[PDB]
Symmetry: D2
Subunit: 297 residues, 4 copies
């Protein structure tokens, strides 16, 4: 049921049909059930073909993006906000046609370091806009999942609590939270506590280390995270995330400030990630079983 | 508002009026507002006096004992068992007369390293007995609080979960858990998870480090403990325990195996522990409020 | 003879003499005994008066800045680099005249998100230039401590090991490391490991929580940090750092992306930070001694 | 070369020949490279047949005991002490006959809950005694490895620091520390700190969880442990150890106080442990490597 996926960009930024094969094959060989893509051009990509290959391998697909400056759905500039809505519509169309059920990533504002404090108007404009978009998405068989990111990557929703308040403000029953452990460790008071507080409104989870390298080679208490996810009975998808300057686009390198590369071999990276996640989850499950064991003699 | 207690044996073993006075004074000068007594001589100690001396000082009181071998209410020997009930009934009365509302400690079995594995009949025997002792305690306006201890100190209730199931077996509505962080860290799958699991059934709490010295100088995750307590909204008394063999009776000193002394200055020990617990709970409270902060612009 | 400090901007961002006065009195009431100032204009401020008021209170002083994009000493454009050196030289004379021993902060490159990936020539330029400014600093009786910051605030020195290498390249013995727990938790593989790796090259430390709010209210493992400092016998100054949109000036709020404020009462915040760092170090002192205890009978 | 090994009590509580040989097979199936026979009676054991299957299975071997009360080498009573020498001589022999390199377990004093606080005489006696036995073991090409245990399992050596001092007192170069994370978590101030303090003198390591069941299902910071071991360049044997009421003795089981059914499926247990240790160590290695990466552009 629950899929454990990986971000395509671990493998390749290239949207060439040949590079897409290697991405999908690597994903499968590394041990994952799901691929997350962040860019696809129908013009260059045969979406219909791509959709069938993803099914043929037994993989699931998710689509996540990050709104560009000129596509900021929360902008007072009405033309900018409209391109934001247009991108989201295109992204939903793509996700539906591709076989996926989730649209994820930074959907509420532009992705990047803003040069101005947020305002209530921004918050409300974004909320009213996502209210409507989420309808489009439902009609398409797709959920919206707002990614909560750190202060340097958006000025709006930084916290699960912020996310929850926003979602209420939307009024939608088709908007959920996309939580990322790399972002949570910067912004949340406890990562485990955030997850618990967000129970039932979590639609998608990124697993990324404090520095975005190998899982377990950083500062994040992953046992604490796997315990919380187990406590709440999270049974939806989760995806590994790590990036290299050598692989990702330089729009993204300059934006997520990847100045140094923490690994050179992505198959080793992904393979480790998959054993780390797999075993972390198993342990957490066994531990939850043990807590409640009566141990009557 | 609930009391932050200390155990007397931190101060001395002696029950002599002159020591009783020092014990209470030191307790206050350390910042604590509850005193825990384990031994109180039936013949040598004025109860109604002590009961007055306690309230005068703005101190709460609790009584904890560890059932001796020859008094194990779980023993098949109806005489040895009977000795246990009298020990209990006498401890209930001393508690009531002292102005305290909880009896605690190892109440369900002998305090010590048992020689045989636990049995189903041993279990039922203790529950059947404690069931009836509980109604006595009720009539006295006192509560029973079963300490859950490590494998070496009882063979019967080592875990919060088995402690929870035992209480279901008694059918009593006046029995609760006494959890101790030193024991919990040995037996529980996850101290915080065990606390969450027992919520609403915890009547008393013992704060003690992994090695039984200064708080924060061992291996226990006290932040996680405070977070859990905060999460389940615990509002009942708790006390610090930490033992020196130069201070405590050679009986308990052999029963809990104090071979080393981790401290010489118990005022510095107690002042440190008070600051540790106070700041700890404050910090966990601010953290739980922060988790839920809508940070709406 | 180490000081426990606090950054002025916890109190006020203003240079008015009445506000500078308040900053100082607040520092003392909170229990700190150093003050860190970000920058003060000599024509705007009665410097000698300030220095005399600092010494009268019994406070020490450090100055930290972050080079402007306008003044980046790593820049190829010489004019920009020269503006850097001149800002550096002025900051030194400020520290010296105020009766301080440390110039800290981002001293190696522009403070902010960079649009270019780092280069070796950028590295060498900064090294070459700082090698010289260190001599100026020595003559003035002051050390240069290079702040190591997260990817979003500089593109050059993000890691304690990067700093070590960088320092190595400067050939200087008046350039040390300025480590910041908030930055370390994002970039380092292990905060404690990184501290241990940097032994005898650490000139200054910022204590700040993962979200930059109240200490212990985030994800940073501070016990591990106090243990590492203690393992290396760190005997120099460290300061508490937390900021509020309400108090800082729009330049800093925007560069460090303070979108939401985690506290409102900065006296409570400071007193708390004082107890937390105070206790934290005492506890780490207690424990590192326990480790070694022979405990022979 | 070093091996990741396993304690026989995962598999069997028996010294019957077929059981011993099952043990070997189960060890190899679980991915382990060493077997440790604990509390083995060599009477009625075909050493040659056993040593043959070890070779076929590609296994290392170690022998671990805990001295009985009437074999306590630290006793004043000379008859009791001479018997403990004879037990040790016998177990040295069996180790050599089986192709082992290590004698291990509670070799310094009686394995159990002493009713006596330790004395300098006991210390000195045991030390002088073991200094001789060490020479015996050297001649047989075998190292001695003192297991440091918790307060309820010996009264002499509970702490790595004590053990370290003890080995100073024996004058030997053939006695080493055998540390156990289960005991360390109860006794040590900090497990990593203890491991770093004992560096160079660590001969053998047990990996066991707080409650002695599944690795990671209890309270122990295993990351910290694998980190410390990595930092000191530990390059000797370590072994998984776990107890459940399913497999029990009437000797070791009684001493270790095992009352609870933490597992029934010892092959799942072992394969999880094997993956845990395996992955934990790779993760530790990658992390330490990362700490000192220069990341110069
Ligand atoms: Mn993400
Ligand atoms: Mn207790
Ligand atoms: Mn800083
Ligand atoms: Mn062991």
């Amino acid at each position: 049921m629950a899929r454990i996926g990986i971000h395509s960009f671990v493998w390749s930024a290239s949207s060439a049909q040949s590079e897409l094969e290697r991405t999908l094959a690597n994903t499968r060989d590394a041990g994952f059930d799901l691929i997350e893509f962040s860019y696809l051009d129908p013009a260059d990509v045969d979406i219909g073909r791509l959709a069938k290959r993803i099914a043929d391998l037994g993989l699931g697909v998710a689509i996540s993006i990050g709104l560009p400056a000129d596509g900021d759905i929360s902008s007072a500039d009405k033309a900018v906000a409209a391109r934001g809505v247009e991108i989201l519509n295109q992204t939903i169309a793509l996700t539906r046609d591709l076989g996926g059920r989730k649209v994820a990533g930074i959907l509420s504002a532009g992705h990047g370091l803003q040069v101005e404090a947020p305002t209530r108007d921004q918050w409300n404009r974004s909320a009213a806009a996502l209210a409507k978009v989420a309808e489009t998405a439902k009609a398409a068989g797709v959920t919206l999942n707002l990614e909560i990111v750190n202060r340097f990557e958006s000025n709006l929703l930084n916290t699960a609590a912020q996310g929850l308040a926003f979602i209420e403000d939307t009024g939608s029953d088709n908007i959920f939270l996309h939580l990322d452990t790399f972002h949570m460790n910067i912004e949340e008071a406890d990562v485990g506590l955030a997850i618990r507080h967000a129970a039932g409104k979590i639609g998608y989870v990124h697993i990324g280390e404090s520095h975005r390298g190998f899982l377990g080679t950083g500062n994040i208490d992953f046992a604490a995270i796997f315990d919380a996810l187990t406590a709440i009975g999270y049974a939806d998808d989760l995806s590994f995330e790590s990036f290299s300057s050598e692989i990702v686009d330089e729009n993204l390198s300059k934006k997520t400030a990847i100045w140094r590369n923490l690994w050179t071999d992505n198959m080793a990276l992904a393979k480790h990630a998959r054993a780390f996640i797999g075993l972390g989850l198993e342990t957490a499950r066994r531990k939850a079983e043990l807590v409640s064991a009566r141990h009557k003699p």
